[PDB]
Amino acid sequence: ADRFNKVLIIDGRGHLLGRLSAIVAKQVLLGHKIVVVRCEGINISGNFYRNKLKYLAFLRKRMNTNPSRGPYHFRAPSRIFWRTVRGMLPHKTKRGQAALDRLKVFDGIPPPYDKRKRMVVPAALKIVRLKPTRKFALLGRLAHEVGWKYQAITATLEEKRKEKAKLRYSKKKVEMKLTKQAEKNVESKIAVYTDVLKKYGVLV
Template sequence: MVSGSGVCAPRVVVDARHHMLGRLASILAKELLNGQKVVVVRCEEICLSGGLVRQKMKYLRFLRKRMNTKPSHGPIHFRAPAKILWRTIRGMIPHKTKRGAAALARLKAYEGVPPPYDKIKRMVIPDALKVLRLQAGHKYCLMGRLSSEVGWNHYDTIKDLEKKRKDRAQVAYERRKQLTKLRVKAEKAAEEKLEIIATWHHSMGHNFPHYEEKHQKLLGATKNREDVTERAE
């Protein structure tokens, strides 16, 4: 996001899972107006306060609003979660001005986590999280479920794609963890060999300070690697 010095990150990827729609939209609108480029993923898991039946009735009332003489002139009724979020943010931005149009152009929203954003670190916004902002026991519904009830046809497709993505991520994580263990094992073996070599040189009266320096560096790297492995497990 925009730092205190006013410097923007090149691009911020926000994981919208279990964020409240209005709070998320207001924070993102402010960041977009400040010049930040934002990508929002997993829009189908955004939360709305209130039960599904109540939210569906509200949205159906919105769907009935149209221009009598020419309905294609508006209002346009979006069904996809990403487009609903986009429209919500648009309502918080002066989008008919050049500044507002430029801010809205910095926003990208997607259902699921499409490439290349599946390999980029994603962040959350604590001020918009459901667990911190919604009263305990209060009813809520997911935007993907609501969208599927009012005409969005890709809910099951996105669920299948997300399941495949999570399976791939789990396989990659296990492989990464295994490689870390192998690296730690190799570093321990190298450390033992260095100790034997250093002991032999000392017994012969040789002085090789670079051996000691390498040994200390390797020892520190091995300890750090062990700490990382323990935390990962």
């Protein structure tokens, strides 16, 4: 990307919580619409027991006199990521509240976005920002063990989504093999046009 997209759809799998939230919160302040899918695929650095204790310590932050007013401990990985981004926004102002409106978080890839291209932020990936010997905690498992009740259905609809996307990619490879076969059959019919692309480095 890096093109001032109309709607930037980022995949959450393999990304770090605060590493992605820091970049997402800056995009929504610049007027960009961000959609983070598969928030259960986000992973947090540190072993699972550490990050779970941090959320369990957050669960205890209820208001003593009336917990219905206190901190709303959201259990879904989407709303967990949504609040992590909210912590990096001036959400109590008008420009910060309008920033949260530009962010849409989803557990898994819903039908509005399963037929879209998901982006990846390499400055927030676990494979890039973490050493291979460090432990990390998946936000899907962390959420399930603090009160998320929709982990099995999200995993069921995701495998249903991958089997459907795998069927198309097989058809897309067949269409690409016929495309590369077409280029060899009309090689003498497009040689005048390839040389224009070869001359200016468009084709190697």
